[PDB]
Chain A
């Protein structure tokens, strides 16, 4: 039941 993830860009 993984944590919610966050999209990113560098």
Chain B
């Protein structure tokens, strides 16, 4: 049994509407984790129960080096807490904003890890649906860790479809902006957007007004920098194909199509998951409490069932 009192609460790492993430130390072990704390009252009143139970189930039933693992999930009378592996290197969003653009080789390393994580997810019948720079963290070694599983859909195999209008606006696949249902190829669209941001230094489609933004996504052709390699242009054009049936990854073989693309020719896929590749950037933290890869905006801030049947959990690691 796990309680709030089993932890020291050190720094705010992130803060959504529906909760906050705090850097915590487990007192008995001296180990550090990221705790997501949600308020039950808010979760219930705002109809976020299904998403929260889904994130719990997904985290309970996945194990992969490029997904953040769940150590403990527990509840109190007014809170739900997820204790997860702490990604010390912060969000890819942090890094890309600092550096403006990544080399193709650096984007390839991250892209390959994301492809492996997506492959694994789809193999567990999970569609992730929210690939974006904020949800892609770096661990202490510089490997990708996908976080935030609340928008996942489970039990999606092969060509099964989904109906919920969800994700993040700037990253929505064109089929999601049409009526009716969509399949798992939405995840390859999201990879293409993040890859495009990594190698081109901006979103492929952007407007502050969601009506204009969604028009661009549906109707505008993407542009490439003249000096992007032909293989990177081809990868991006393939993942950002508007028709999911023509999209790279959109066919029956799903991730395999992406892994086979010439952009990834140099990648040994069997080695990606075994983490034999030296990452192109190791976070230079000087302590487990060093939050230099997280925004001051958050880290400066001080920190003063039936329905939830499938929630609680203790890992076998």
Contacts and interface: CB of A to CB of B under 8 A. Distances in A.
Interface of A: 1-2, 4-10
A1 B164 contact: no
A1 B98 CA distance: 8
A2 B151 contact: no
Interface in B167-196: 167-171
A6 B210 CA distance: 12
Contacts of B151: 7, 9
A8 B202 contact: no
Contact of B171 (A4, A5, A9): A5
A9 B172 CA distance: 12
Contacts of A9: 51, 151, 164-166
Nearest to B201: A1
B97 A1 contact: yes
Closest 6 CB pairs of A and B: A9-B166, A10-B165, A5-B168, A7-B168, A1-B97, A5-B170
B148 interface: yes
A9 B132 CA distance: 15
Interface string B126-145: 00001010100000000000
Contact of B134 (A1, A4, A8, A10): A4
Contacts of B148: 7
Interface of B: 16, 51, 93, 97, 100, 130, 132, 134, 148, 150-151, 164-171, 202-203, 206
A1 to B, nearest CB: 5
A2 B206 CA distance: 9
B interface, by DSSP: helix, strand, loop or mixed? loop
Contacts of A10: 164-166
Given A8-B169, A9-B151, 13 more contacts: A1-B100, A2-B202, A2-B203, A4-B134, A5-B132, A6-B168, A7-B132, A7-B151, A7-B166, A7-B167, A8-B167, A9-B51, A10-B166
Contacts of B203: 2
B197 to A, nearest CB: 8
A10 B93 CA distance: 25
6 contacts: A2-B97, A2-B170, A4-B93, A4-B134, A5-B171, A9-B165
A1 B96 CA distance: 8
A3 to B, nearest CB: 9
Contacts of A4: 93, 134
A6 B130 CA distance: 10
A8 B170 contact: no
A8 to B, nearest CB: 6
Nearest to B203: A2
A6 B171 CA distance: 10
Nearest to A1: B97
Contacts of B165: 9-10
A7 to B, nearest CB: 5
Contacts of B134: 4-5
